[PDB]
Amino acid sequence: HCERLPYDASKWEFPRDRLNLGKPLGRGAFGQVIEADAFGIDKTATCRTVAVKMLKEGATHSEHRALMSELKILIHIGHHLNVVNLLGACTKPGGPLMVIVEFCKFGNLSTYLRSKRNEFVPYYKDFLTLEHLICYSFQVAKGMEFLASRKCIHRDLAARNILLSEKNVVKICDFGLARDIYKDPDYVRKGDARLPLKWMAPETIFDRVYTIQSDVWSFGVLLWEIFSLGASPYPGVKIDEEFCRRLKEGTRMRAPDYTTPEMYQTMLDCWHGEPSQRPTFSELVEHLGNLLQANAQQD
Ligand SMILES: COC(=O)Nc1nc2cc(Oc3ccc(NC(=O)Nc4cc(C(F)(F)F)ccc4F)cc3)ccc2[nH]1
């Protein structure tokens, strides 16, 4: 829902005097995220690194409302291992509105996988393997199955919106910063931005239609990103009216360099032209769970 939903301060409110703000993690035109140290945020006697979303200086009513809405949305969604974890909030008088979520130390999965291209083998202590890639895929499907059950649609499911925490746990998020149409051109490097059109289901381009089944299409692109180790989709292709036409017609990406046949089949399944014929997230959880277990079995 929205900023007007009730807010259970007993459950969520965290003292500002137990938050020590550190360095920025991300900044856009409408909000910023800062790394922070929070003491006792999960009831134990520990100092935990967290990420704090808050407003920038000079924020309007509209911006405040937007951040309050996000907070209520996150409370509504609830907790899942593979979704951005809301830990607390600072909303009462005497300081800025702050939304506190778990920090995922390895950052976004696209950049991470790119950094591991020379540290990948199919089947080496710090290497990635097929086991890793299929596990990340499975985890995202689990998170999306959960989001679907909360009646949420992601709308921009991509590897850049997946964060990697310790112990190879990935979490789905939606930064909502718009960093790459905000970033100073002096400091923009190749790789910083991505083109969201490349993740959109045909019906999302042509009918502006967002559904859970359009997220399944996007998940197929995310799979392609995983098994290309963080490459950009549709390499070399110009994303114009022509590309869109070809897409509605049946043209698809070729297999990425690190895929197994079964994973490329799944991509193709996710890219069905008919939304109702794409797998559901529940179906993807079962199938990828099977692929994961088969991957690690004995002879
Ligand atoms: C190098 O290491 C790193 O930099 N590590 C790291 N950097 C960061 C940055 C960070 O900022 C964020 C992320 C997301 C967010 N909110 C957000 O997800 N909201 C959201 C999610 C969803 C849905 F569907 F995805 F679940 C639906 C609607 C919705 F509003 C707020 C702040 C959080 C954690 C983190 N860890």
CSV table of N, CA and C and ligand atoms in Angstrom, one decimal, residues 25-26 32-35 50-53 69-71 73-74 77 82-84 99 101-108 144 147 152-154 161 163-164 172-177 179, ligand 1:
chain,number,residue,atom,x,y,z
A,25,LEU,N,26.5,4.8,0.4
A,25,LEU,CA,26.5,3.6,-0.4
A,25,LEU,C,25.9,3.8,-1.8
A,26,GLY,N,25.1,4.9,-1.9
A,26,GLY,CA,24.3,5.2,-3.2
A,26,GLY,C,23.6,6.5,-3.0
A,32,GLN,N,19.1,9.1,-0.7
A,32,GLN,CA,20.4,8.5,-0.5
A,32,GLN,C,20.4,7.4,0.5
A,33,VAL,N,21.4,6.5,0.3
A,33,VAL,CA,21.6,5.4,1.2
A,33,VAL,C,23.0,5.5,1.8
A,34,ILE,N,23.1,5.4,3.1
A,34,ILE,CA,24.4,5.5,3.9
A,34,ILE,C,24.6,4.2,4.6
A,35,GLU,N,25.9,3.8,4.7
A,35,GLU,CA,26.2,2.7,5.6
A,35,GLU,C,26.2,3.3,7.0
A,50,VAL,N,24.6,-1.7,8.8
A,50,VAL,CA,23.3,-1.7,8.2
A,50,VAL,C,23.3,-0.6,7.1
A,51,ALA,N,22.3,-0.6,6.2
A,51,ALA,CA,22.1,0.4,5.2
A,51,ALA,C,20.9,1.3,5.6
A,52,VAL,N,21.1,2.6,5.5
A,52,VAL,CA,20.1,3.5,5.9
A,52,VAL,C,19.7,4.3,4.7
A,53,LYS,N,18.4,4.2,4.3
A,53,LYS,CA,17.9,5.1,3.3
A,53,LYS,C,17.3,6.3,3.9
A,69,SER,N,6.1,5.9,2.2
A,69,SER,CA,5.4,4.9,1.4
A,69,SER,C,6.3,3.6,1.3
A,70,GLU,N,7.6,3.7,1.0
A,70,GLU,CA,8.5,2.6,0.9
A,70,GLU,C,8.6,1.8,2.2
A,71,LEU,N,8.7,2.5,3.3
A,71,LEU,CA,8.7,1.9,4.6
A,71,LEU,C,7.5,1.0,4.8
A,73,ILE,N,5.5,-0.2,2.6
A,73,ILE,CA,5.5,-1.3,1.6
A,73,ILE,C,6.4,-2.4,2.1
A,74,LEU,N,7.6,-2.1,2.7
A,74,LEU,CA,8.5,-3.1,3.2
A,74,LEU,C,7.9,-3.8,4.4
A,77,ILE,N,5.3,-6.2,2.9
A,77,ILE,CA,5.9,-7.4,2.3
A,77,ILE,C,6.3,-8.4,3.3
A,82,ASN,N,15.4,-14.1,1.1
A,82,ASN,CA,15.9,-13.7,-0.3
A,82,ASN,C,15.2,-12.4,-0.7
A,83,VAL,N,14.7,-11.6,0.2
A,83,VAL,CA,14.2,-10.2,0.0
A,83,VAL,C,14.9,-9.3,0.9
A,84,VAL,N,15.2,-8.1,0.4
A,84,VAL,CA,15.7,-6.9,1.2
A,84,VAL,C,15.1,-6.9,2.6
A,99,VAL,N,15.1,4.8,6.9
A,99,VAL,CA,14.7,3.5,6.8
A,99,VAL,C,15.9,2.5,6.8
A,101,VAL,N,17.8,-1.0,6.5
A,101,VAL,CA,17.7,-2.4,6.0
A,101,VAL,C,19.0,-3.1,6.1
A,102,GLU,N,19.1,-4.4,6.0
A,102,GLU,CA,20.3,-5.1,6.1
A,102,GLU,C,21.3,-4.8,5.0
A,103,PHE,N,22.5,-4.8,5.4
A,103,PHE,CA,23.7,-4.5,4.5
A,103,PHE,C,24.2,-5.8,4.0
A,104,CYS,N,24.5,-5.9,2.7
A,104,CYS,CA,24.9,-7.1,1.9
A,104,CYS,C,26.3,-6.8,1.4
A,105,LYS,N,27.3,-7.3,2.1
A,105,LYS,CA,28.6,-6.9,1.9
A,105,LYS,C,29.3,-7.0,0.6
A,106,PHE,N,28.8,-7.9,-0.3
A,106,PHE,CA,29.4,-8.1,-1.6
A,106,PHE,C,28.7,-7.2,-2.7
A,107,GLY,N,27.7,-6.5,-2.4
A,107,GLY,CA,27.0,-5.5,-3.3
A,107,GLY,C,26.2,-6.2,-4.4
A,108,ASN,N,26.0,-5.5,-5.5
A,108,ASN,CA,25.1,-6.0,-6.5
A,108,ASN,C,25.7,-7.2,-7.3
A,144,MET,N,11.2,-14.3,-5.4
A,144,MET,CA,10.1,-13.8,-6.2
A,144,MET,C,8.8,-14.6,-6.0
A,147,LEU,N,7.5,-12.8,-3.1
A,147,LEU,CA,6.9,-11.5,-3.5
A,147,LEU,C,5.5,-11.6,-4.2
A,152,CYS,N,2.9,-8.6,-4.8
A,152,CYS,CA,3.8,-7.6,-5.3
A,152,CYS,C,4.3,-7.9,-6.7
A,153,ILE,N,4.5,-6.9,-7.5
A,153,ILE,CA,5.2,-7.1,-8.8
A,153,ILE,C,6.4,-6.2,-8.7
A,154,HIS,N,7.6,-6.8,-9.1
A,154,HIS,CA,8.8,-6.1,-9.0
A,154,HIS,C,9.0,-5.0,-10.0
A,161,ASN,N,19.8,-5.3,-9.2
A,161,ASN,CA,18.9,-5.2,-8.1
A,161,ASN,C,18.9,-6.4,-7.2
A,163,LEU,N,21.3,-8.2,-4.4
A,163,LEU,CA,22.5,-7.9,-3.5
A,163,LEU,C,23.0,-9.2,-3.0
A,164,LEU,N,24.3,-9.3,-2.8
A,164,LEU,CA,24.9,-10.6,-2.3
A,164,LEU,C,25.4,-10.3,-0.9
A,172,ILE,N,16.7,-9.8,-3.1
A,172,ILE,CA,16.1,-9.0,-4.1
A,172,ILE,C,15.8,-7.7,-3.5
A,173,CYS,N,16.1,-6.6,-4.2
A,173,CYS,CA,15.8,-5.3,-3.7
A,173,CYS,C,15.3,-4.4,-4.9
A,174,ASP,N,15.0,-3.2,-4.5
A,174,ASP,CA,14.6,-2.2,-5.5
A,174,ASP,C,15.1,-0.9,-4.9
A,175,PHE,N,16.2,-0.5,-5.3
A,175,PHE,CA,16.9,0.7,-4.7
A,175,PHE,C,16.1,2.0,-4.8
A,176,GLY,N,15.4,2.2,-5.9
A,176,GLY,CA,14.6,3.3,-6.1
A,176,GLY,C,15.3,4.6,-5.9
A,177,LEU,N,16.6,4.6,-6.4
A,177,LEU,CA,17.4,5.8,-6.4
A,177,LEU,C,17.5,6.5,-7.7
A,179,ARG,N,20.2,6.0,-9.9
A,179,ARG,CA,21.6,6.6,-9.7
A,179,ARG,C,22.3,6.9,-11.0
B,1,LIG,C1,29.6,-3.1,-1.6
B,1,LIG,O1,28.5,-3.5,-0.7
B,1,LIG,C2,27.3,-2.9,-0.8
B,1,LIG,O2,27.4,-1.7,-1.2
B,1,LIG,N1,26.4,-3.5,0.0
B,1,LIG,C3,25.1,-3.0,0.1
B,1,LIG,N2,24.7,-1.8,-0.5
B,1,LIG,C4,23.4,-1.6,-0.1
B,1,LIG,C5,22.5,-0.6,-0.4
B,1,LIG,C6,21.2,-0.7,0.2
B,1,LIG,O3,20.3,0.3,-0.1
B,1,LIG,C7,19.0,0.0,-0.3
B,1,LIG,C8,18.5,-1.0,-1.1
B,1,LIG,C9,17.1,-1.3,-1.2
B,1,LIG,C10,16.2,-0.4,-0.5
B,1,LIG,N3,14.9,-0.6,-0.6
B,1,LIG,C11,14.2,-1.5,-1.4
B,1,LIG,O4,14.7,-2.7,-1.7
B,1,LIG,N4,12.8,-1.3,-1.4
B,1,LIG,C12,11.9,-2.1,-2.0
B,1,LIG,C13,12.1,-3.4,-2.4
B,1,LIG,C14,11.1,-4.1,-3.0
B,1,LIG,C15,11.4,-5.6,-3.5
B,1,LIG,F1,10.5,-6.1,-4.3
B,1,LIG,F2,12.5,-5.7,-4.1
B,1,LIG,F3,11.5,-6.5,-2.5
B,1,LIG,C16,9.8,-3.6,-3.3
B,1,LIG,C17,9.6,-2.2,-3.0
B,1,LIG,C18,10.6,-1.5,-2.3
B,1,LIG,F4,10.4,-0.2,-1.9
B,1,LIG,C19,16.7,0.6,0.3
B,1,LIG,C20,18.1,0.8,0.4
B,1,LIG,C21,20.9,-1.8,1.0
B,1,LIG,C22,21.8,-2.8,1.3
B,1,LIG,C23,23.1,-2.7,0.7
B,1,LIG,N5,24.2,-3.5,0.9
